[PDB]
Design a protein around this ligand. Structure first.
Ligand SMILES: *[C@H](O)[C@H](C[C@@H]1CCNC1=O)NC(=O)[C@H](CC(C)C)NC(=O)OCc1cccc(C(F)(F)F)c1
Ligand SMILES: *[C@H](O)[C@H](C[C@@H]1CCNC1=O)NC(=O)[C@H](CC(C)C)NC(=O)OCc1cccc(C(F)(F)F)c1
Ligand code: NA
Ligand code: NA
Lengths: 303, 303
């Protein structure tokens, strides 16, 4: 037993990380087959980054302006193109460590592992949730751009995120691997703000089920509520509305615990109104919303 | 910026995980050069596990009783020996993916990454701190024994933990890679309890420095205190005493922030007496003690 925020093992992605240099800018790239993917802002300069025309910038580049390094071995670039906000550098060697992979775009409320990298070298792994406002709460320093987010399913890596920037509030923004931003953001140094966020209700309920499975029961009660009455409380506390689909996805956890979803919703209602009164749930004194039902089932089915 | 609990990239350890089967018991082993290390309780049966004599149990085994599998490829065992609570199975192939490594024993208050594995296959990575009472707060199901904990330093893996069991409170216990338990525990199914725990004061202070570096300042104040006066408050709240060595290790963080350690200690004193009053620090509503000064410097020096 135990419930811990847990990343996927990063080995399959570590074998894909390279370093991409253009001019005096160095960041990370993702080397799959004979193509390296990286943020297109690597071709910007200190003065371009205010409002650059990337099509003009790329037309003025040649293959020899791109220094790619897989460890010590330099990779020769034989072509370059832009796909939305990602640059694709064709190289003369197919990555022999290329895993089975997909490029997927994820939904707000879903989680993924981030492999934070600097100079093409992995440094750390951690879990992120895509917030309703399309930001993530990461840990990224200068040099981390091109770090990717991913999930793994039966040795197939589904890449869903490439890191591009930090917003003024300290949260992070990036693209899918097609180069399309998550959220209403652009890859330039301007005044950008994330919209207001909300709490991911189905995830909070999944985590309360994780808590029960691990022996935290103090917040339970004999009451049940209705879906419409719960969504009234959700609106007041800036929680997302609970849908019948969410109730269905929580079915397995409700079955394992014998606690109906609308039974657990009554507990959440009371936690929102009364707080915790000095107690904790799974080691937290706040309601946690960054664990999906899948994340919980992954760790709690055996218990 | 940002501060996130972060594991080391797990690739170097993934390449060392195998599956070890003896009888009807399957767990994980660590394959380094031509030796596989795993918990010796793999040679126990359902009735042996109450109070087994492991020396007798191993004398009655032969090499062919041990099924080792590195993925699909079965590894042939050519020798077996016991070192304290770990079994060493000699195999006829040196692991070609063996990293540079050390076996180190860690101290209470220090952290490490855990690569949770089942059937020799890695499933997740997360950070743990060795508690003062020599337990860890992990996430381990049946089949996870033989999963290891490690730190990485310049492509050298320092292995410090192998998982053996779960205590009645749900926390976890294991050995170093020499087979010596952390804490006053034994590898059999009996009545074992962890002693009382305490809070790791130097780690809480390191995390408060991380908070300041990331823009959380609401808990700061103009006051400073003395080391002896702070340790009086530490005793009352079940915190470990602060030593001058701890003050010295926090030197870099105090320099980066301009906040003396005894200045930060006054803030902790007030947090312990007054609580947070509905506010959070780095996304937590509790004082976090599982980040070492090293962990903080790793993520916060660039900010
Ligand atoms: C790419 O490595 C970098 C990643 C940033 C740096 C700090 N944290 C991150 O996530 N991305 C950028 O620097 C990005 C580039 C423009 C889109 C062209 N701009 C950006 O994030 O500016 C915001 C910012 C905030 C704090 C610190 C920095 C600094 F590190 F660049 F100084 C930048
Ligand atoms: C080895 O894979 C296993 C790891 C345990 C199982 C559940 N969580 C863990 O960390 N270790 C044992 O099963 C261990 C073996 C003895 C030392 C010989 N015994 C043990 O942990 O018993 C406690 C326990 C608690 C909850 C659930 C179990 C169960 F999974 F075995 F049923 C065991
Ligand atoms: Na209820
Ligand atoms: Na102070």
């Amino acid at each position: 037993s135990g419930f811990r925020k847990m990343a996927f093992p990063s080995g399959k992605v570590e074998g894909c990380m390279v370093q991409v240099t253009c001019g005096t800018t160095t960041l990370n790239g993702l080397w799959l087959d004979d193509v390296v993917y990286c943020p297109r802002h690597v071709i910007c300069t200190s003065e371009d980054m205010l409002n650059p025309n990337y099509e003009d910038l790329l037309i003025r580049k040649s293959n020899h302006n791109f220094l790619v390094q897989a460890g010590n071995v330099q990779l020769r670039v034989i072509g370059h193109s832009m796909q939305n906000c990602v640059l694709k550098l064709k190289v003369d060697t197919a990555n022999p460590k290329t895993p089975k992979y997909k490029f997927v775009r994820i939904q707000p409320g879903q989680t993924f592992s981030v492999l934070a990298c600097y100079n093409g070298s992995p440094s750390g792994v951690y879990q992120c949730a895509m917030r309703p406002n399309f930001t993530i709460k990461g840990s990224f320093l200068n040099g981390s751009c091109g770090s990717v987010g991913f999930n793994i399913d039966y040795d197939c890596v589904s890449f869903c995120y490439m890191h591009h920037m930090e917003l003024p509030t300290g949260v992070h923004a990036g693209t899918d691997l097609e180069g399309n931003f998550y959220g209403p953001f652009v890859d330039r140094q301007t005044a950008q703000a994330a919209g207001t966020d909300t709490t991911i209700t189905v995830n909070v309920l999944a985590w309360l089920y994780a808590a029960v499975i691990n022996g935290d029961r103090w917040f339970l009660n004999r009451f049940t509520t209705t879906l419409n009455d719960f969504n009234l409380v959700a609106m007041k506390y800036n929680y997302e509305p609970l849908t019948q689909d969410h109730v269905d996805i929580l079915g397995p956890l409700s079955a394992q615990t014998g606690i109906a979803v609308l039974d657990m919703c009554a507990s959440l209602k009371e936690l929102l109104q009364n707080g915790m009164n000095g107690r904790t749930i799974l080691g937290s004194a706040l309601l946690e919303d960054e664990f999906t039902p899948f994340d919980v089932v992954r760790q709690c089915s055996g218990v």
